[PDB]
Amino acid sequence: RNLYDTDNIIYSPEGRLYQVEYASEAIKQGTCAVAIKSKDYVVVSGLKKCISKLSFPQEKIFKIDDYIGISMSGITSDAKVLTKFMQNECLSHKFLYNENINIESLVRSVADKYQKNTQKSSKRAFGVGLMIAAYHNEPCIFETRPNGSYFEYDALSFGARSHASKTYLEKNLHLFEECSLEELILHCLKALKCSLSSESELTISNTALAVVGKNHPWQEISSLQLEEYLSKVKMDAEQ
């Protein structure tokens, strides 16, 4: 409604915060990221955005701590601010208490940071949604939204045209829990491909993939290993 979307502290007659809804709308315009987890591992894959022929693809997944990583969808400046916040929180917890931070408390603090920006008219919601993959006694996937909510998932996918990925995940969810690491990586790549347009293809340049696990600190998958996995995906899809 034209009269109630001017500022972020005004509810519509339906009790809606249109500015926060538009901050969320910013998320749907980003590239697709998918994250799934087995009993031991979290695999996070994403599509890197290439502006043009001569441009390098942009980063999609970032490391927060030894066993914490994130993917983002939306405004990159907001994603950077939140990433710096999370990295400093993890490092300061390690400094003060000589132990890893609790991922639930980290996500709660990030959600509070989200919320505090929606209460004043001199501020605005973050136009970025975060996917947080971590290992703290177990694999965990969190999604933080612009309005200050956070949820925990067994599989998650956001970004542009990610409903195909969601369909694939809903179809194959029962298989992820008992999967091995290779099977989980293949499943994540297959969901990303499901999102991907047919004209586009998954290559080592435009695909980002990371794993975090029991004794597996958050690590990006090397280019050679990624090429092997993509070849496997193409071969088994050819059948």
Partner: protein, 256 residues
């Protein structure tokens, strides 16, 4: 706090096969005046962590309130037993507090022991935490806890902090520490640990003017944190030359 006024004497904590045994006498002295004789100097932080102090009672109480509220916040945020803070976490917190106050030159006139069980794999006491009712006071055997799963840590006024298999504060650092460095051994049973601690406390009672023989023992075990019934330590002199009448010594010279 410019200095100590009402003070508590040494505390002794040791590891034994079932957990942590920590002992302190229940006396707080206002100088040379033993004004308070039933004071509590060991506090429960949570089901696996205790804090003992030697030094100013006011600063000890301030720290105890800080730790109580830290535990309450932890419990509020807890979703699984693994979320509860550990003795190592509390030791780090207290060390940071002391370091910052040293930097401000506004110290707490205290030496602190933070002891407990650094593990959640020996019981399910933290599945449902009760703060205002102690079900312990229906008896199952204790669990043999590995020494590496136990934690005793020391913090001093300057923020110096460390951990060991046994920690002493106050005057204990001489008498009890000598006896422990001689006779302590791993996987002691409860009775052996109590006998060693009782020897140390008896020596302290004989050689320390600010101590008493009214003792409080606290056990951190798989059953949780248990306060024993305070008891009077029997302390008899070890020589008859002490009791020998002075009139039976030669009346000439300096025989006193």
């Amino acid at each position: 706090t410019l200095g100590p006024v009402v003070t508590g004497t040494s505390v002794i904590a040791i590891k034994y096969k079932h957990g942590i045994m920590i002992a302190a006498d229940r006396k707080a002295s206002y100088g040379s005046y033993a004004k308070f004789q039933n004071v509590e100097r060991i506090f429960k932080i949570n089901n696996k962590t205790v804090m003992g102090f030697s030094g100013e009672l006011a600063d000890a109480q301030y720290l105890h309130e800080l730790l109580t509220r830290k535990n309450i916040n932890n419990l509020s945020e807890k979703k699984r037993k693994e979320d509860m803070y550990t003795p190592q976490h509390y030791h780090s917190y207290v060390s940071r507090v002391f370091y910052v106050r040293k930097n401000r030159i506004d110290p707490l006139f205290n030496n602190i022991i933070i002891a407990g069980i650094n593990s959640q794999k020996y019981d399910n006491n933290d599945d449902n935490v009760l703060l205002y009712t102690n079900k312990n006071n229906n008896n199952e055997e204790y669990k043999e806890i590995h020494k590496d799963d136990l934690y005793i840590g020391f913090v001093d006024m300057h923020g110096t902090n460390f951990c060991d298999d046994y920690i002493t504060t106050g005057y204990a650092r001489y008498f009890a520490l000598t006896l422990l460095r001689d006779h302590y051994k791993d996987n002691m049973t409860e009775e052996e640990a109590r006998i060693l601690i009782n020897e140390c406390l008896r020596i302290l009672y004989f050689r320390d003017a600010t101590s008493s023989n009214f003792i409080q023992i606290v056990k951190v075990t798989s059953k949780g944190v248990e306060y024993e019934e305070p008891y009077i330590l029997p302390c008899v002199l070890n020589s008859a030359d002490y009791v020998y009448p002075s009139t039976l010594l030669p009346p000439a010279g300096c025989m006193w």
